[PDB]
């Protein structure tokens, strides 16, 4: 077909401005974020560290001790699951709570909402983030709320937004990736603006396709990125759809009523921890230091422990390298008299650093949870200073659970209002089995 | 945490009658449990006095 | 419907 | 491919692979039994309803760690490593306590390799005068390695579940400590016990 | 139309099969080696070879299986039945037949 | 300054601006000021927010 495009470039510049300083001013927090998460999957070792381990013939070995701690964090939150609940400012409110503690409740069972908490609570624990969706579906009795999650690397924040649950942000939005195919059928009418996206970014791969490597997005399976972002603007909260060529959905008012009646934001993020440069960073960070003295003292303790140390006398006619490599095998020999060949001592660097390995050890096992609350701790030690361990690790973890309640009662706060938007009569008569809470229908 | 608003109910329930503080009736408490039989208990409970 | 799953049942795991 | 991976047919049976295939389009849920030769069964909407009346995938899938990259792997990931340690330090313990290192004076018409095979067995004998051969110090190597070993031992020993929630002491507590040290394997295990229940109650919805 | 069509879905489901094989191949393999670690095959050829050529055994030890075995223990320990609850008091019996049926 | 502090090179497209809320005490009583380094936003008047 014709389809005319390329407009102009001031629109496109305006529409995706955002999204680029949102790039472009959190690259380094999310660098650290991801090295935090691979450190946590399994991958401690650098490129070049790897390539000199095996180009010596030393195997690289990785003893990961931040799994441990992050799982011991995640299964403290799961066991200290809670229930949604609404609680009466005043008597007469009373019946009004019993009507919202079962609506709330049952959107926390048709999402799944136990699910997506603890995943969010898996990305706070690892990357300091957690982002959770509060839209809508499709039922068979009607239109219902419904709760999705966001991962970190799909989510983007304002920059200068200080507080941890956002409040002063002036935007945020999600990044999504649809097959062309799926998008035409979505949204026909944007077909001028979905364009192919096949070349991998190699500088920013945080919101590129999960797969780096897909070579299939040529004809076959063609793959666009999708951004919906909602912003504050002056007159109040505006949603807008949009790719990297256009506008899939024009600057429109939010369509999710918040709670005093006003277009809101869905999304509800919360954050961990804050720097002084609004990089938010989890509590894997501070186990990023001993964890290497884990790994490379193990690997030079290896180092100085299979190989020997020679001098060998100029009047030897052997190269020195073949002579040493020769008097490190278990079954090595030399020929000559007793002075040629002269071994020097290196068993003291090798009890060097396994005592700082040891020690590096016990630094990370004090490190974050006090690794009672996880049952693992050091031995030989009475039950009474393993519960005062786990309470003081508790205490410790006393700002992540906040972190998780403030999150919950935020969601719950917008399923409500949702609620309150989009329920009818005859699905509260469903879902309640009460006749009164057709009194509680819509906002007025 | 509770898997129903119910299960919850029939916990506070249990919890008011433990002390013995409150008197609660029977009726209303197998009322708001999870047990199978709740028709025929409910039933046996409110038949009306004998005619002797 | 009757009884749909999380209308009006709730699917967990007993004893 | 088919397990035995032998497939000899010198002929036994004949083994064929069908690919069951529930995919998601614009519309709905749709299924399909197919090879690559032909179609077994036409694509058509799937025939199992789902919680909103409207066809779905009966296939229930979980996974316990995903990666950055889509990766999906288990707990045996973390004791990959040490397992291959410990291996690895125990056969070089093993090769340098049974063997040996001699220095040989020139002036020994044996082969040196010979001489030290001698000089390693437990009944080998040699002859010449004091200064001829020469047994240098390998012990501290297998100390070390040794040392090590257990280091690794102990490491994995921490890594997976707990030893006490395994039912090994491993330094003879009082015993009040064993019932929190459980709780905290609980703890640390309370993923994957929740990934099981969430598989379960997806199974119990379908 | 229908020779196209079908031959565009026999298209579509094989490729569809191959990329999910071939994004996989990292993963797969990682995966079925440590199924092997757990299944006592804890050597490589290589190595296997040269201790054979040395004259040592191979000797393996290992602890996987045991921590494996430790957890499925624990997942059948914590085992549970499928119950079905009522939203409301009048969809009890409802529930019932679910706890009657599942 | 600015949180971020990228400044020198960002924040082109998006202009951001800063300004001074102040509470002095004079002899009078609290005043209250919204300023910047150019001018006033709210001129000088007496706190709106009544004490105890």
Redesign the interface.
Same mark, same amino acid.
């Given at each position: 077909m014709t389809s005319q495009e390329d407009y102009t470039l001031e629109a496109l510049?305006?529409a995706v401005?955002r999204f680029e300083?949102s790039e472009?001013?959190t690259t380094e927090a999310r660098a650290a974020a991801?090295r935090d998460?691979?450190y946590y999957?399994?991958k401690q070792w650098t490129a070049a560290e790897k390539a000199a381990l095996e180009r010596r013939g030393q195997?690289a070995?990785?003893?990961?001790r931040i799994?441990?701690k992050v799982?011991?964090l995640?299964?403290?939150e *799961?066991?200290t699951? *809670?229930?949604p609940r609404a609680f009466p400012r005043n008597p007469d409110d009373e019946e009004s709570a019993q009507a919202a503690?079962?609506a709330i !409740?049952?959107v926390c069972?048709?999402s !799944?909402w136990? +699910?997506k908490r603890?995943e969010a609570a898996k990305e706070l624990a690892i990357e300091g983030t957690c982002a959770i969706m509060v839209g809508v579906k499709?039922? *068979?009795?009607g239109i219902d709320p419904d709760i999705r999650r966001i991962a970190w690397?799909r989510f983007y924040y304002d920059?200068?937004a200080?507080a941890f649950d956002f409040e002063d942000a002036c935007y945020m939005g999600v990044v999504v990736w649809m097959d062309l +195919? *799926?998008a035409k059928?979505?949204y026909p009418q944007a077909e001028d603006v979905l364009i192919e996206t096949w070349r991998q970014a190699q500088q920013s791969e945080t919101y590129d396709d999960?797969?780096?490597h897909? %070579?299939?997005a040529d004809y !076959?399976?063609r793959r666009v990125r999708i951004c919906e972002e909602y912003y504050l603007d002056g007159e109040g909260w505006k949603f807008c759809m949009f790719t990297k060529a256009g506008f899939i959905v024009p600057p429109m008012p939010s369509p999710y009523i918040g709670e005093d009646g006003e277009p809101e934001c869905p999304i509800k993020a919360v954050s961990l921890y804050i720097d !002084? +440069?609004?990089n938010r960073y989890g509590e894997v960070r501070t186990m990023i230091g001993p964890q290497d003295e884990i790994n490379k003292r193990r690997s030079k303790? %290896?180092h100085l422990?299979?190989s020997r140390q020679v001098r060998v006398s100029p009047n030897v006619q052997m190269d020195a390298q073949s002579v040493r490599k020769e008097?490190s095998?278990?079954?090595?020999?030399?020929?000559?008299?007793?002075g040629e060949?002269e071994?020097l001592p290196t068993?003291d660097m090798?009890?060097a650093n %396994?005592a700082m390995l040891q020690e590096a050890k016990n630094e990370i096992d004090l490190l974050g949870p006090n690794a009672? %609350?996880?049952?693992?701790?050091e031995?030989?030690?009475?039950?009474?200073a393993?519960?005062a361990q786990?309470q003081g690790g508790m205490t410790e973890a006393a700002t992540y659970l906040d972190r998780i309640r403030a999150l919950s009662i935020a969601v719950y706060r917008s399923v409500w209002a949702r609620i309150r938007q989009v329920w009818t009569g005859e699905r509260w008569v469903?879902?309640? +089995?009460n006749e009164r809470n057709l009194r509680f229908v819509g906002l007025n | 945490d509770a898997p129903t608003i119910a299960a919850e109910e029939f916990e506070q329930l249990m919890k008011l009658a433990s002390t013995g503080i409150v008197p609660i009736p029977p009726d209303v408490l197998i009322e708001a449990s999870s047990l199978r039989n709740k028709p025929k208990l409910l039933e046996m409970l409110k038949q009306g006095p004998s005619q002797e | 419907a009757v009884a749909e799953l999380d209308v009006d049942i709730l699917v967990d795991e007993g004893l």
């Amino acid at each position: 077909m014709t389809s005319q495009e390329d407009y102009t470039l001031e629109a496109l510049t305006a529409a995706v401005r955002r999204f680029e300083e949102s790039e472009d001013a959190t690259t380094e927090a999310r660098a650290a974020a991801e090295r935090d998460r691979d450190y946590y999957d399994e991958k401690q070792w650098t490129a070049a560290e790897k390539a000199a381990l095996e180009r010596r013939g030393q195997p690289a070995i990785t003893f990961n001790r931040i799994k441990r701690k992050v799982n011991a964090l995640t299964g403290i939150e *799961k066991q200290t699951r *809670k229930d949604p609940r609404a609680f009466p400012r005043n008597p007469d409110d009373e019946e009004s709570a019993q009507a919202a503690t079962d609506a709330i !409740r049952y959107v926390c069972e048709d999402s !799944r909402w136990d +699910d997506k908490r603890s995943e969010a609570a898996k990305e706070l624990a690892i990357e300091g983030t957690c982002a959770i969706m509060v839209g809508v579906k499709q039922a *068979k009795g009607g239109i219902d709320p419904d709760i999705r999650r966001i991962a970190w690397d799909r989510f983007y924040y304002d920059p200068h937004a200080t507080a941890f649950d956002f409040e002063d942000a002036c935007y945020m939005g999600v990044v999504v990736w649809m097959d062309l +195919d *799926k998008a035409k059928a979505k949204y026909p009418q944007a077909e001028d603006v979905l364009i192919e996206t096949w070349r991998q970014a190699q500088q920013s791969e945080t919101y590129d396709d999960k797969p780096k490597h897909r %070579l299939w997005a040529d004809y !076959r399976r063609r793959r666009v990125r999708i951004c919906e972002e909602y912003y504050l603007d002056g007159e109040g909260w505006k949603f807008c759809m949009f790719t990297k060529a256009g506008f899939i959905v024009p600057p429109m008012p939010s369509p999710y009523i918040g709670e005093d009646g006003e277009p809101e934001c869905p999304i509800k993020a919360v954050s961990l921890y804050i720097d !002084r +440069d609004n990089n938010r960073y989890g509590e894997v960070r501070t186990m990023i230091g001993p964890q290497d003295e884990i790994n490379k003292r193990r690997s030079k303790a %290896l180092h100085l422990i299979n190989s020997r140390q020679v001098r060998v006398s100029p009047n030897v006619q052997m190269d020195a390298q073949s002579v040493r490599k020769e008097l490190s095998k278990p079954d090595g020999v030399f020929v000559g008299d007793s002075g040629e060949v002269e071994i020097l001592p290196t068993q003291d660097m090798a009890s060097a650093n %396994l005592a700082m390995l040891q020690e590096a050890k016990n630094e990370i096992d004090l490190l974050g949870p006090n690794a009672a %609350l996880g049952g693992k701790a050091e031995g030989q030690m009475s039950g009474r200073a393993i519960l005062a361990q786990q309470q003081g690790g508790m205490t410790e973890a006393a700002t992540y659970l906040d972190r998780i309640r403030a999150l919950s009662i935020a969601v719950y706060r917008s399923v409500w209002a949702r609620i309150r938007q989009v329920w009818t009569g005859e699905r509260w008569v469903r879902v309640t +089995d009460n006749e009164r809470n057709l009194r509680f229908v819509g906002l007025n | 945490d509770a898997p129903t608003i119910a299960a919850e109910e029939f916990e506070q329930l249990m919890k008011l009658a433990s002390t013995g503080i409150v008197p609660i009736p029977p009726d209303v408490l197998i009322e708001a449990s999870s047990l199978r039989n709740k028709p025929k208990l409910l039933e046996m409970l409110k038949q009306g006095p004998s005619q002797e | 419907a009757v009884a749909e799953l999380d209308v009006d049942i709730l699917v967990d795991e007993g004893l």
